[PDB]
From a paper:
The phospholipases are classified into four groups according to the cleavage site; phospholipase A1 (PLA1) cleaves sn-1 acyl chain, phospholipase A2 (PLA2) cleaves sn-2 acyl chain, phospholipase C (PLC) cleaves before the phosphate, and phospholipase D (PLD) cleaves after the phosphate. Here, we report the first molecular structures of plant PLA1s: AtDSEL and CaPLA1 derived from Arabidopsis thaliana and Capsicum annuum, respectively. AtDSEL and CaPLA1 are divided into the following two domains: the α/β hydrolase domain containing the lid domain, GXSXG motif, and catalytic triad and the C-terminal domain containing the dimerization domain. In addition to the conserved α/β hydrolase scaffold, GXSXG motif, and catalytic triad, plant PLA1s have an extended C-terminal domain composed of approximately 70 residues.
In Arabidopsis thaliana, DAD1 (At2g44810) was identified as an sn-1 specific acylhydrolase, and several studies have suggested that AtDSEL (Arabidopsis thaliana DAD1-like seedling establishment-related lipase), one of the homologues of DAD1, plays significant roles in the regulation of cellular processes such as seed germination, tissue growth, and seedling establishment. There are two AtDSEL molecules in the asymmetric unit, and each monomer chain consists of 16 α-helices (labeled α1–α16) and 11 β-strands (labeled β1–β11). AtDSEL shows the typical structure of an α/β hydrolase; core β-strands (β1–β3 and β6–β9) are flanked by several α-helices. An additional two β-strands (β4 and β5) and surrounding α-helices are also common in PLAs; however, C-terminal α-helices (α14–α16) and β-strands (β10 and β11), colored in blue, are unique features. AtDSEL has two disconnected loops caused by the disordered residues; Arg120 and Glu121 between β1 and β2 and from Pro159 to Leu160 between β3 and α5 could not be assigned due to the poor electron density map of the residues. The theoretical molecular weight of dimeric AtDSEL is 95.7 kDa, and calculated molecular weight from the AUC peak is 95.3 kDa, which strongly suggests that AtDSEL forms homodimers in solution. The dimerization domains of the AtDSEL homodimer cross each other and stretch in opposite directions. Met396 and Trp404 of one monomer and Trp388 of the other monomer interact with each other. The hydrophobic interactions are main driving force behind the formation of the dimerization of AtDSEL. AtDSEL specifically hydrolyzed the sn-1 acyl chain of 1,3-diacylglycerol (1,3-DAG) and 1-monoacylglycerol (1-MAG), suggesting that AtDSEL is an sn-1 specific lipase, as previously known.
Numbering used by the authors:
A (entry chain B): 17 to 119, 122 to 158, 162 to 419
B (entry chain A): 14 to 119, 122 to 158, 161 to 419
Write the structure that this text describes.
Amino acid sequence: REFAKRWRDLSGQNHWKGMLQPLDQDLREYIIHYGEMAQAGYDTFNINTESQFAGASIYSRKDFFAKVGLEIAHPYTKYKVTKFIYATSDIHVPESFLLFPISGWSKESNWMGYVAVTDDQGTALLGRRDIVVSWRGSVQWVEDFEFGLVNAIKIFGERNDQVQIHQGWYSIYMSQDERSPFTKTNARDQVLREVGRLLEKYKDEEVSITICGHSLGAALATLSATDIVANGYNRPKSRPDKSCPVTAFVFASPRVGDSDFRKLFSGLEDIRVLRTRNLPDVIPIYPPIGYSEVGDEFPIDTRKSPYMKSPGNLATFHCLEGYLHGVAGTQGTNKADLFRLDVERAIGLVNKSVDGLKDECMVPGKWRVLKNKGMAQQDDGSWELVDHEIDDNEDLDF
Amino acid sequence: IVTREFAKRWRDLSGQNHWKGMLQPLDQDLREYIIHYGEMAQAGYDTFNINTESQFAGASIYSRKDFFAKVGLEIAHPYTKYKVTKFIYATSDIHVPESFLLFPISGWSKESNWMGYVAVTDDQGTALLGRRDIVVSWRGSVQEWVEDFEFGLVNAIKIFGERNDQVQIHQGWYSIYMSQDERSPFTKTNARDQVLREVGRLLEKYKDEEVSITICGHSLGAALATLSATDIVANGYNRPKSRPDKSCPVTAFVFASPRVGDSDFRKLFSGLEDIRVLRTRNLPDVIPIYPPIGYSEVGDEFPIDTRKSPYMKSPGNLATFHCLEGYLHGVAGTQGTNKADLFRLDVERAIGLVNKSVDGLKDECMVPGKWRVLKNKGMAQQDDGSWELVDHEIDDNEDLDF
């Protein structure tokens, strides 16, 4: 019952005052909960460029959280995924952001995240009907976050015509491919439309929007949240007087825009952003000049974990499961604060996509992989690469 | 299947007449027969844990129960109706390459490996294959240096008796076959005697039926298969204990075989009437030349040339010319090794199998390279939310009741 009673404070109503140093124990679990919904994006994203479905989702929407390990011992992850989101980019971006079959299912678009909503049981457990937008992040160079600023008037309107945004985040959020069934509408508007459907469906209940993302996903989650609140997409179409809170839990966030972006953000009453930042991770410094941060910061230091390989590197300091292990055991970032896991979070999760744990933990490095990389024996004895569950992504009946 | 082609021809398919008339060109039944036993050797690779970060590196992933279904040999394998009755473990008194004995970095054993299995047809398989077929499958080499195969000769009197005291065997094959570890529950008895005992149990169980022994192996497994077949026949272990006058045929289907012993080993082999060995040899694979000096080959040879496959990436390398699934692809489509013979698949064998442990197919085939792996490398969410490395099915390997 504790999360339901306190959810507005846990979602940042008072900017997490009193809840960060030391870390509030409910908030410790709350942050990990939304970080898991961002990691689920990595766990479904096909990164095998030898596959024709590289850059698509492995799993379909149906029973999605059960398929990525978020049902067992996750009594609060009672969400239904209602829509997958796809993105493209008019400019060239790193393969860590858009990755393609070495040939394919698409030449220019990737699966870029999903929209989900609590079912009736999850709504009871969380205190409110929670709409989650989870933006997929970076896959395995700090020069990848290399971008000049661009004017964002097409997002924030003539009334905010001085706002500028990183050209890469802008391009992934806003670009379309008229020839594509996936990105003929851009990632932005796919999200806005589906969030609008859910807000209208649940217009008579208490509702929240929580947006999740790591690395690239953190930038998109920050941009998405600011867009939604600034343009009033956190109101049901038929109830323009009912605003719902929009909170982003973001991890290892690069910066998103300039000082005018920060100014716009600072005037929005209904938005809150908690940026969890690992002190040895350098990606939150980029880009290193010209940009402003927005939101509240929560620092951790995974070098204090006795489970993590020392010294770490760019990958291990950045990786999202490393972050969530840091949240799980952080007792502060001062030299005297001693790391201690205060939730039952399996350390082995750290090694999904890195060699991050000490060898004595006995967990193989970079272990996440489909059985046989997806190759599967068929009923006629043939062997086919079955690394993609079919899902037309049609609107669900509601 | 309805005509029982294999049951009717099994003695010839198992080499009764040294495969005369069946190799050039390749007899169609024999094409499928060779692949059948090569799959039983490949099953040893498919269960062998090669992840040295695991405590169970060097052990079997799967248990004996429903073994062939677990390694993909049930669907569309109507003839693979075998029960695995015993796992076989080996050690070495001398240091050997990691491709032969592989150990955890840290572990379940410091000196032994899973080294193969013994299986037997069930009553349905016995009907389909024409006899009660006892299979010994020796596990082979894991992933490369041809010097890994270069050992000197040792006297093999402990195997073949003072009556054959001139026979010499490769020191490496001898050591893996014969070594024991007194402190190990796995190799306190050597791999040789584990196999002899279990084959003996099965011959005695089925003493009143028609029986065959077929021994399978690739690379290291091919050498052990050849050595164990010669041991078994030379020492009379192909007779049930209570019927010393009932010999059964011993046939070894081996793939990419290094040489095993010297000229006296070949002379011993030539005098055994009940043994047959068919060595399938890929011409661009250099391993069957090793060791190059001092050794003889035994048995009948069946050459193939996977360079003729339009499915295989060109040029190949040591690994792709040697790999067992490449060999079985070559068998599936060989029409001869002459320049003018054109490769053509004459069985429905999925080309994707080639890429289990190599990048062997042309990129146009759209099959990922080196694809064989457990889901999540065996990491598994448990019912209490913990995540544990579950890459080993428990099997105490106790004798089955028969």
